[PDB]
Structures are given as structure tokens and as C-alpha cells.
């Protein structure tokens, strides 16, 4: 039926607001709700998988651990959300260890995605069995969809958003925050000016400008990615080619294999031997030894030709906007994100203000009780029951049942001189807070300034240098 | 293993390997078979405890099985959900367990080949009997140990307020050795236990006879009939025996052969299949047609019709012969006692259970006694404060800080820091007339409790009487009529 697709496209494509699919959102939220934060010891992955399975994804589905694992791989995510410990696989064919052998916890950036989620910043909905509530989206204090990108298949409509530099994106966002009046085309230009292009975790080089611009303005484009090969004098002492970087998503093992197989086919003469000298110290380092009668330049170009040393990234900016799949331009992605940020901020202050009032209400009744301490005390001791006392206090002080209950819940230790003053002082602080909150609600410029300052803090702390180099040649 | 005369470097490695195996498998066996005390294997114990720790109690709504499977998987059994759900499911089937521990809702399968629904479609919760297995587990009644990752503690055994191992029985294979204990009647077992409680001085031969006298034999949840006495007796006195089970066929006619019960563990579908596949092979001539007419509200009903020629029950006898309408239960009372597998006699099973019950009770009393004292300590200081209420109140209001107040109170009342902190933690509502009296009354109750507790610790007869009364209560509520009929 019509809702069939609406569900297939839910597991297939990412939301534009946080850039996540239901699985990942569930996993992250589960870890959060479990307290698996960065300032705490890693927890066995089985714990996270289990918390997700029982509350949100009731399947012995391998897709849970698969999501947890992937969000931990620095070669897959430009900005990882999971902090892994143990065997989480490799850029090659080496498979990850079982749930029970690995440990995981959230990264500081992931903590920014969940920031203030308990302050009604996003809409929650009941889970599969209706016992608990789950988030439809995360606050996403940092532009995750564009930062980490996304890749998924729908009914022939598969998304393919590339990763980007956090510092750059933040610049584009800051511009959109100040130029709220601007029109799309005026914005499309400013954002395209700040975001130089994709920034893959694997580094490498992007060759050209067409693919990028096409993607940013038409939501579709072919980006030319190229590995990084160095030329070295070997112990031969002749020439050896050294590939230190590969294009995004290129499997190291499959790559080396294609070279050896392509060679045997006779398609890659000039090559004497291939050897992997990679390591955590040296990083990627595939040494290709060329024959003494060979030109480095010709071998290189033949590599670009017959291997993934040079490959294309087929960008397709397709995301879910209000439950409907859509192909977007960079300016739309940016505006939809900013809108969400603003929505989060108003909702946050709306919530804080409500709770601030409830707090002040109680305090006003505690202060009243203080000004009549001797009376309330005698009244309470004279009362045969707490009910009588509750009723007597309401009458005696002119307060409601909640306020009257707060007084009866008060502890002896709060009667100490400095304790009593603390109640007074608090009341003043709370009233001042309420005012400031009401001010934010009244001024859209204040709200805009808040998202800007908070985002700036985030970029200062977690922002990093660009990895992928753009080559106009 | 092997033998000695070699003097080689390859034989040093051979000896060590044999040693590691012995140690290795001597430990694996501790898992394959059930413990004497609670009758459970680690999987089941973990599942039950997880449900308990989650609050999935009989007095609350069923929860999706996936929740139970998940709680188990993450805290105690991180290997997968297959083994877990299978255990949860098995413990909910009234045709498998004489006394189910899990209360299932939805498709938990059938006595035949119909498979259960997925964990997201079924719901489950603990039965009242399961709640008895976990009774007082939070009062240091059993030894706990850290779990796989050391983040949480898990039980090595459950309090087991009812004789589960003998009640529900058990069947497993560890290392060539496989246990096979049959289920029994709770009311009967309780009688045997009550006897052992009163006749603590009795000897093996006497106890054996006394218990064999109260437990008439296995009582399968699938009812049926046991033919003979040798098998049963053999099992109860040698820990091994062959018990003959028989279905219940009550033939009828037109209007123009009805099997209503099958032996324990006999698959309904496989049974009917064996009949048809054999008949068509001519091996079972004299049968016109088979027909399943069972349904909830009627029960098992397999209709078998004979040819005109033979209206003889000789067809019944041919059934007993070539089908599972009559099959044997190979009893083998093998359980884990102190980490070591052992074949036991009914009296040993009974005494080891009683010992555990007694252990649980003194441990419970010991714990309750400690907590009471800590409680009485606090109360004594709250009462003191009450007798000087006006003073303590003025003192507190005069104190510039809670520290000053804490110090002032210690002096003023002659009490320690803990007692002095309890007073400062006291709430206004506790100053109400009836509230104040409640503190006084409590102190008297606590002191009385402590005394009684200390008494239990001193008297073994009191401890024995406690397990007897509590067990009696359980049998009155959850005990049920016998199902299997003997001879
Ligand atoms: Na008021
Ligand atoms: Na005292």
C-alpha cells in the first residue's frame, strides 16, 4: 500500500534534520539512556545491542551491532559517533569481533547530538510495545547529515551524501544565521562559497569542480576522487611507488587484489612486486615496486585507469523532509538544519520556563512558611495527622496543595540560618531566570544568537583540519 | 589417559593436554547438568533472574518476550538471543513443565510441530511459583558472583522455596553423561520434605523408605499412565530405572479407538505421522482412517478407526508395539552437587534440598537481624530527639550551618554522627502527632523483631519449623491434583 513505501523509505533514507536512519538513532539513544558516555568506562557492545533490541528494535537482527560497529570506524565516519575498543574491523576485509569481545561508548560529538534531549526539544513517540517513548529525531547540535554524509538504497532511489568539514559547514551555517532574510539563490551562492566541498575521512584528493558544484546546485553530481601515491628510491636502488591514501570507501584488500589480478591478466606491466607496509604508526602504505625499465609516470596513470586509485563518488543528495523523500541543494540542506536548530532552541526555552515557574511557585510557598516558622511548626506538631497539617497550612498560609506538600516534605536541616537564606536567595535567582527565558522567547535575534554561540563552542572544541585536498587541475 | 614408559618431549605435551581437558570438561559439566538445590541450568536461572530484576511479576502486565531476552543477553548471556528465547519458551509450555515458571501470552508453540512466534509477537511474565524460586533473593540468601563483564552481580543458585528439580525434573547431556529426572507431584514431594524436616536424625535406609512412601512416582504434566513399579523403585533407590509410560485410548463406535492422552514428551504430530506412515506400509493393518479432532476446550483427541474384520483391541496392542502410544522413560537422577556430578537416590535429593532450605533461612535471618539493628540504632536517636523536640528545633534554627547543627545535636543528645544526620534528614511531616507516635511504636516493634530473630538463630527447631510452614503455605496455594495414573 501507500504506507508500505513510506516505511521502506524510512529505513532506507536519512532524515534531513539529524542525518540518521531509525537504526542508528535508536542505537545512539539507547547508549545515551544507558549512560555510556565518554567520561566513563567503555561498556561491552553486547550491552548496547541488548538495550536497543529490547526497547526499540525487537529483532535478533545483526543490523544493530553492524550500526554500532560502523559508527565507530574512523575510516567510514568523518566524525565518529561511537568510541570503540577492540576489534572493530579494518579498512580491508578483516571482520570485527563478536559483541561480547568488543567494548563501546559515545564520543563527545555524539553527546552533542543528544544535547538537551530531556528538555522536550524533539518529538517523542511510543515504541514498538508502547511501554517507552522514543525520539523521532535528535536535537543534532551539529550538522550531522552533511558532516558524516549518508548512503542508502530505496525503491531505486538510493541516497549518497558525502562527508564534509565541520569548520566549513559551521561557517555556512553562521552565514545562514545572520542572513535569515536572504533568498535561496543568494544563499546557494554564499554556502557554496564557504563549503569548499567533500572532506573524506580517508583524505585523498578531489580532481575538478564540476562534480562538486553540480551536486551542490542540482543535488546530483559525479565527484572524481584520487588516491595519493608517492615516488620513492628503494633499496634496489631503483623506483618504488608508494600509495599513502586511497579514495573514500575503497577497500584496501580488494584494491591490492585488483592490482595482482590485473597484473596476471597482463594488463599492468612495469610492476615487479606489491607489498603492504601499513601500520598504526605509518598508516596506509602500499609499496609497488616497478621494474628497472619502467617509467613511474606511466605506471601511475595506468593505475588510475585500471584500479580504484582513481574512482568517482556519485553524489545524490536525497533525504527525508517531513516524511517525504527529496533531492536537495546545499542551501536547502543548510536552511532545514538551521530551522531545526531554532525549533530546538524555542522548545528548550519553552520547557525551561515552564519548569522555572513550577520551581518559583514552590519557593514562594517555602518563603511564606519561613516568615511564619514558629506558627507552622506549632501547627504541624498540634496536627494529629499530616492531612490535618496539610489542610491547616493551606489555610494558615494561603497556598495550594502542592506548595503545602513541599513544606511538609522540607527537612529539618533546611531550617539552619544559612539554609533559610538560601531559599530566599534562590527565589530571587529563579525570578531572574524566568525573566531572561521570557526574553529569549520574545527576541528571535536572541534565539539565532544562541544557536550561533553554542555551535561556535562546538566547532572550537571538536572542529578539525580539512583532510581531502581539492585539485583544480 | 594413556600409559607411561616413553621419556619423550612429545609426551610431556601429551600429559599436560590430558590434564587441561580433565580440568576443562570437569568445569563444562557444571553447566550441562542442573544443580540439586534449585534444579536449574545457568541459562534458565539467568532468564528467570533477569525477568525478576526487571519486575516482570505475576501481578503486572505481561511484557514482550524480547524485553526478557534482551535483559538476559546484555547482563548474563552475551552470546545471542537464540538460546535465550528457546529457554524462555520452554519454561512457559504446560505440556513440557509440570509447574511452569514463565507465564506466556501468544503463540508459544504446541505439543506438536507448530513453531512459536517471534519474541516481538509474544509476551511473558513470571508465574507465582517462579516468584517462590526467587523469594527473598535480595536478603543475602544465596551467593552472588560477578557477571561476564564484572559490572553486575548474578546468583549462583536461587532460594528455591519449592523443590523444583524434582517437581519439574530435567533432561540434559554434559559429557557422554546425560541427566533425565522425571517431574513429580508438588503435594507429594512436600509430604516427603515435611517428613525429612521432622525426622532430621533418621538414617539413609529409614529416610529412603519414608520418602519412597510419600512420593508415589512421576507425575507428568501430560498425565497418562505409568505401568509397573520396578522402574520407579529402581530409579528412586539406584538413581537409575526404566519407567513404562502409556497413553490413554478410550475406543468408541457409530452411530451408523480414541486416544485422549499420550506419554510424556511424545510429539503429537510425529505420533500421528508414525501411524499413517506405518499403516500405509501394511505394518499396521486393520486401521480404516486416522483423524485429529483435538481443539482447545476439548483437548487431545486422535480418532483411529479399525476395519470391519478386526474390531479387536489387538489394534491397541499393535499401537503400543509400533508407536509411542507406549514408550519408556529412562530415568537417570544425575545432578550437580558442590560442582561435582552425582547420581542420587530420592532420599539424597530430598536431604540436599532441605539443607539448602535451612541454609537460605539462617542466611535470611542473619541478614534481617543486621538490618534491624542498624534501624533500631537510628530510631533510638529519633526518639531521643522527640523527647527534646523544642530544644532540637531551637538549636537547629539557631545554628548558622547544618554542620554546627549536626555537632550541636551530637552533644545535646549524646548520639553519633549517623544518628545526628538522621534527625537532620527528618521531614516536617514526621512531627505530626500520629507520626511521632509511629516512631515510638516502631522502636518497640524493631526491638521485638531483633529478639525473635536472635531466637531463631539460637534454635534449629525454629529454623526447621519456618521452612515447614512456608512450604506448607506454598503447597496450599499452588499444589495440584495428580495427573499421571499408576498401574
Ligand atoms: Na503563593
Ligand atoms: Na543510642
Author numbering:
A (entry chain B): 29 to 501
B (entry chain A): 9 to 264, 269 to 499
The article reads:
Mycobacterium tuberculosis DNA gyrase, an indispensable nanomachine involved in the regulation of DNA topology, is the only type II topoisomerase present in this organism and is hence the sole target for quinolone action, a crucial drug active against multidrug-resistant tuberculosis. DNA gyrase and topoisomerase IV consist of two subunits (GyrA and GyrB in DNA gyrase, ParC and ParE in topoisomerase IV), which form the catalytically active heterotetrameric complex (i.e. A2B2 and C2E2, respectively). The GyrB Toprim and GyrA breakage-reunion domains come from separate subunits and cooperatively form the enzyme core. The breakage-reunion domain contains the catalytic tyrosine responsible for the cleavage and religation of the DNA double helix.
The crystal structure of the breakage-reunion domain we solved to 2.7 Å resolution, revealed a promising interaction that will be further exploited for drug design. This interaction involves the N-terminal helix, which is anchored in the active site of a symmetry-related molecule. The crystals belong to space group C2, with a dimer in the asymmetric unit. Consequently, the final model spans residues 9 to 499 for chain A and 29 to 501 for chain B. GA57BK forms a biological dimer in a ‘closed’ conformation in the asymmetric unit, as the C-gate, which constitutes the so-called primary dimer interface, and the DNA-gate, the secondary protein-protein interface, are both closed. In contrast to other structures of the breakage-reunion domain alone (i.e. E. coli DNA gyrase, S. aureus and S. pneumoniae topoisomerase IV), the N-terminal segment of GA57BK (residues 9–41) is ordered and is organized in two distinct secondary structures. Residues D9 to E16 form a loop whose B factors indicate high flexibility, followed by a 24-residue long α-helix. The α-helix is deeply anchored in the active site of its neighbouring molecule. In addition, D30 establishes hydrogen bonds with the hydroxyl group of the catalytic tyrosine (Y129) and a salt bridge with the catalytic arginine (R128). The presence of this N-terminal helix would prevent DNA binding.
